[PDB]
Design an enzyme around this catalytic site. Sequence first.
Site, PDB file in Angstrom:
ATOM      1  N   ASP A 271      17.014  -1.908 -27.048  1.00 29.80           N
ATOM      2  CA  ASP A 271      16.566  -1.230 -25.818  1.00 29.80           C
ATOM      3  C   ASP A 271      15.387  -2.006 -25.262  1.00 29.80           C
ATOM      4  O   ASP A 271      14.281  -1.919 -25.803  1.00 29.80           O
ATOM      5  CB  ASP A 271      16.167   0.215 -26.122  1.00 29.80           C
ATOM      6  CG  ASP A 271      15.975   1.077 -24.862  1.00 29.80           C
ATOM      7  OD1 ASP A 271      16.014   0.555 -23.713  1.00 29.80           O
ATOM      8  OD2 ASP A 271      15.770   2.318 -25.064  1.00 29.80           O
TER       9      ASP A 271
ATOM     10  N   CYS B  78      16.343   1.010 -16.472  1.00 27.12           N
ATOM     11  CA  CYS B  78      17.106   0.915 -17.708  1.00 27.12           C
ATOM     12  C   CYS B  78      18.508   0.332 -17.487  1.00 27.12           C
ATOM     13  O   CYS B  78      18.996  -0.487 -18.290  1.00 27.12           O
ATOM     14  CB  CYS B  78      17.178   2.285 -18.385  1.00 27.12           C
ATOM     15  SG  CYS B  78      18.164   3.600 -17.481  1.00 27.12           S
TER      16      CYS B  78
ATOM     17  N   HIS C 261      19.540   7.867 -19.586  1.00 25.09           N
ATOM     18  CA  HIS C 261      19.078   6.567 -20.091  1.00 25.09           C
ATOM     19  C   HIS C 261      20.276   5.786 -20.629  1.00 25.09           C
ATOM     20  O   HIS C 261      21.251   6.376 -21.078  1.00 25.09           O
ATOM     21  CB  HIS C 261      18.007   6.780 -21.162  1.00 25.09           C
ATOM     22  CG  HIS C 261      17.457   5.512 -21.743  1.00 25.09           C
ATOM     23  ND1 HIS C 261      17.007   4.471 -20.960  1.00 25.09           N
ATOM     24  CD2 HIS C 261      17.247   5.139 -23.024  1.00 25.09           C
ATOM     25  CE1 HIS C 261      16.596   3.489 -21.740  1.00 25.09           C
ATOM     26  NE2 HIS C 261      16.730   3.870 -22.992  1.00 25.09           N
TER      27      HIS C 261
HETATM   28  S1  LIG Z   1      16.821   4.232 -16.102  1.00 31.13           S
HETATM   29  C1  LIG Z   1      16.041   5.067 -17.511  1.00 31.13           C
HETATM   30  C2  LIG Z   1      15.549   6.393 -16.979  1.00 31.13           C
HETATM   31  N1  LIG Z   1      14.784   7.052 -18.019  1.00 31.13           N
HETATM   32  C3  LIG Z   1      13.403   7.308 -17.742  1.00 31.13           C
HETATM   33  O1  LIG Z   1      12.926   6.967 -16.709  1.00 31.13           O
HETATM   34  C4  LIG Z   1      12.525   8.029 -18.738  1.00 31.13           C
HETATM   35  C5  LIG Z   1      11.181   8.425 -18.116  1.00 31.13           C
HETATM   36  N2  LIG Z   1      10.550   9.416 -18.941  1.00 31.13           N
HETATM   37  C6  LIG Z   1       9.677   9.029 -20.032  1.00 31.13           C
HETATM   38  O2  LIG Z   1       9.456   7.879 -20.283  1.00 31.13           O
HETATM   39  C7  LIG Z   1       9.064  10.158 -20.856  1.00 31.13           C
HETATM   40  O3  LIG Z   1       9.798  11.351 -20.608  1.00 31.13           O
HETATM   41  C8  LIG Z   1       7.577  10.343 -20.529  1.00 31.13           C
HETATM   42  C9  LIG Z   1       7.390  10.935 -19.134  1.00 31.13           C
HETATM   43  C10 LIG Z   1       7.020  11.294 -21.591  1.00 31.13           C
HETATM   44  C11 LIG Z   1       6.846   8.998 -20.606  1.00 31.13           C
HETATM   45  O4  LIG Z   1       7.395   8.250 -21.668  1.00 31.13           O
END
Ligand SMILES: *SCCNC(=O)CCNC(=O)[C@H](O)C(C)(C)CO
Length: 246
Positions: free
Chosen positions: A127, A74, A112
């Site tokens: 985004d 991100c 994020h």
């Molecule tokens: S650098 C951005 C970091 N954020 C990130 O990785 C979010 C990951 N999590 C998800 O995407 C979400 O919680 C899940 C696991 C339900 C899958 O969408």
Amino acid sequence: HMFDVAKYLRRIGVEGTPPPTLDTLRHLHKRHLMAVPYDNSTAPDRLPASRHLTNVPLDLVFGHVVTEGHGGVCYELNRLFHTLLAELGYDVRMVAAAVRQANGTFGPEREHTFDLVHLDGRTHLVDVGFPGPSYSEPLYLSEEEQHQYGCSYRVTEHDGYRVVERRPKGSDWQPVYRFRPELADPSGWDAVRLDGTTFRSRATDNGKIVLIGRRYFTVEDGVERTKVLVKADEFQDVVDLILAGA
Ligand SMILES: *SCCNC(=O)CCNC(=O)[C@H](O)C(C)(C)CO
């Protein structure tokens, strides 16, 4: 290589230098998500010792994603996109957010990083750097329901936050992440602090494909399907499909 707008537009399949309008912003956003995959596979290799994003030269990121054609995470994809939009004339502001976890709760406040664009008196969420199921075209900063390719979205207010919520076909509303709009900042990237599962994804013409570990998710015109991949050759075919872009 050094940051170059023309090279970037070519990388994401956009011709010429379209004018600074909402229709152009929608196209750029969707092309970027289709062309440039999310991939955290080598993200730790680009971490700086100091945990200050500023110590990661923008040109290093540009080289990896645009020149060499790889994906990123991100604070790489949305950092580059913010710079592209600013060079294309938009008023872009960086914001951080807490993500709704797999367990249903929200994580750390600055996990994020994404952007907002203020254009012709309205604010849009931008985004191109979120791994899971989310919007392929910018959202209005509004609680009013908005629809894209058969999915519904809205941005509600709860407890000092704005919450992005998504509703695909046959499901109830689910938060994606939450943020404080008053903390948006044109120069916010310069202040970002960076203090085992692989996540890869990209958009398609009518939805998104996402691979978290063995868990393969597709949404097509709002219709979702998931499959825990078993076979090694099917797994690799899915990785290649995502990373090749569209
Ligand atoms: S650098 C951005 C970091 N954020 C990130 O990785 C979010 C990951 N999590 C998800 O995407 C979400 O919680 C899940 C696991 C339900 C899958 O969408």
